[PDB]
Design a protein around this ligand. Structure first.
Ligand SMILES: [Mg+2]
Ligand SMILES: [Mg+2]
Lengths: 276, 276
């Protein structure tokens, strides 16, 4: 009773929560976990692949940022060992299980809550895209220009959000609201504002994305887009099961929908002049 | 290379930060990790053991909170497999490696710092230790008495720190500083002080324990005790890599020392008056 788990990075703030879910379920079902953590290397990922085969694991489970031809090749050579390939976005007619998170709808929702709160001068601390694409469509649809000097890439880690917010806030003209593409990154943004002497949400409104466990325990309690992370691994982990037992060779798609969690990091903006 | 890890719980406060350092070191070398959480069932651990032997892991890391004779005996059968069996707890004359975290010392440094900064009416949010004990000695030694109404425990998680902080802060009379035995928990206390209109540390000073990865980016930047978890993880790993090749049958002692990290959550107390 063991299961392989070939990841792209346990420590990749994005994925991470998913793993914990795959994990806690295994222990919960007293299985053994055989953790492989690649990082995009045909051989390393290969290595990890054969080893789980030799340790005769009762199920596989892949989580990959990409799925290039080579990887895809290997993956087939090991079809005898039952699995679940979590493939985000691009539903390519292969044999991978499609994960549809509705990030595009996620970012949409965020950018829209801000327009509705009356903000028109907006900042964005983008991660390393669908979300973002979502946010620009509402900005576009509302005719809000976004100065390029108010768009600063983060990396999912607090120091990046800390450096990003300070860059944005530290300009003659600044926005009244900032869209943060990651709750963790948003924790580093709340800090910088505070250290600069800015009252959040009073001087700057902030909305993040994820709804990480601690997000409600931020100061202030963080308004964000709840992205079901630890629902995905439990499902993926169940698709693995049925697959090994019931012999479910026919694939499945895991799709979720985003939801806005209203809390306390967002205030009314100056454009409450237009409507009530 | 495959490495096996037997632990009571991967998700337990103390271990959590230790297991991730291990994991991080594994993937760095390219090793695979075989994870198992046994929880205290002689039988279940006795099952993970046989299987790991069966999967031919190159080495074993054992960390268990308690090692009853019977666990120790079964481990003795598997001594052909290189292992590091971490033992917190009173050093015994057996093959276990000793782990010495100097918690009582961290607790004391914490108390003392508070007392030095001028506070005398202190509150406490203990975890479900020896740190608490070392904390109380710095108290007892400065004649300070800490009332029961100002002691409320948590369980490592944020809501627990929130609820206890609210409880202590809602007292007709309140401490001027609080000792939180765990940063995560402190994350919650910090949010609680805020939602009650109290400013940290203008109105209340706060000190945590651990110095978790994000602490510096808490709001405000947290004053806490750095308790080394990553170093321990690193240390055990390397000891295991050593035994794998330099097959060493000599128990080792791992000692770490806590260190105070002065950030921005603690201010001068009323009784502060010894210098600048
Ligand atoms: Mg983990
Ligand atoms: Mg509506």
């Amino acid at each position: 009773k063991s299961i392989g788990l070939l990841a792209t990075s346990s420590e990749a703030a994005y994925f991470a929560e998913i793993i914990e879910a795959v994990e806690k379920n295994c222990f919960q079902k007293g299985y053994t976990l055989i953790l492989g953590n690649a990082w995009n290397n045909l051989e390393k990922q290969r290595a990890y692949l054969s080893m789980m085969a030799q340790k005769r694991v009762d199920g596989l489970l892949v989580m990959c940022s990409e799925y290039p031809e080579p990887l895809l090749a290997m993956l087939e050579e090991y079809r005898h060992i039952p699995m679940v390939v979590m493939d985000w976005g691009e539903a390519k007619a292969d044999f991978t299980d499609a994960v549809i998170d509705n990030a595009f709808e996620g970012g949409y929702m965020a950018g829209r809550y801000l327009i509705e709160r009356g903000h028109r001068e907006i900042g964005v601390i983008p991660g390393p895209a669908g979300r973002l694409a979502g946010f620009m469509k509402a900005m576009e649809e509302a005719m809000i220009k976004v100065p390029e000097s108010w768009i600063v890439q983060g990396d999912f880690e607090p120091e990046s959000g800390y450096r990003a917010m300070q860059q944005i806030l530290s300009q003659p003209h600044r926005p009244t609201a900032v869209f943060c593409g990651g709750d963790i990154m948003a924790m580093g943004a709340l800090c910088a504002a505070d250290e600069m002497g800015l009252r959040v949400p009073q001087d700057v409104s902030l909305i993040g994305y994820d709804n990480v466990r601690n997000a409600r325990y931020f100061t202030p309690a963080l308004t964000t887009i709840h992205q079901p992370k630890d629902s995905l691994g439990e499902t993926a982990f169940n698709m693995l099961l049925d697959r090994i037992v019931n012999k479910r060779e026919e694939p499945q798609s895991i799709e979720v929908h985003p939801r806005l969690i209203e809390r306390r990091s967002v205030a009314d903006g100056p454009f409450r002049d237009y409507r009530r």
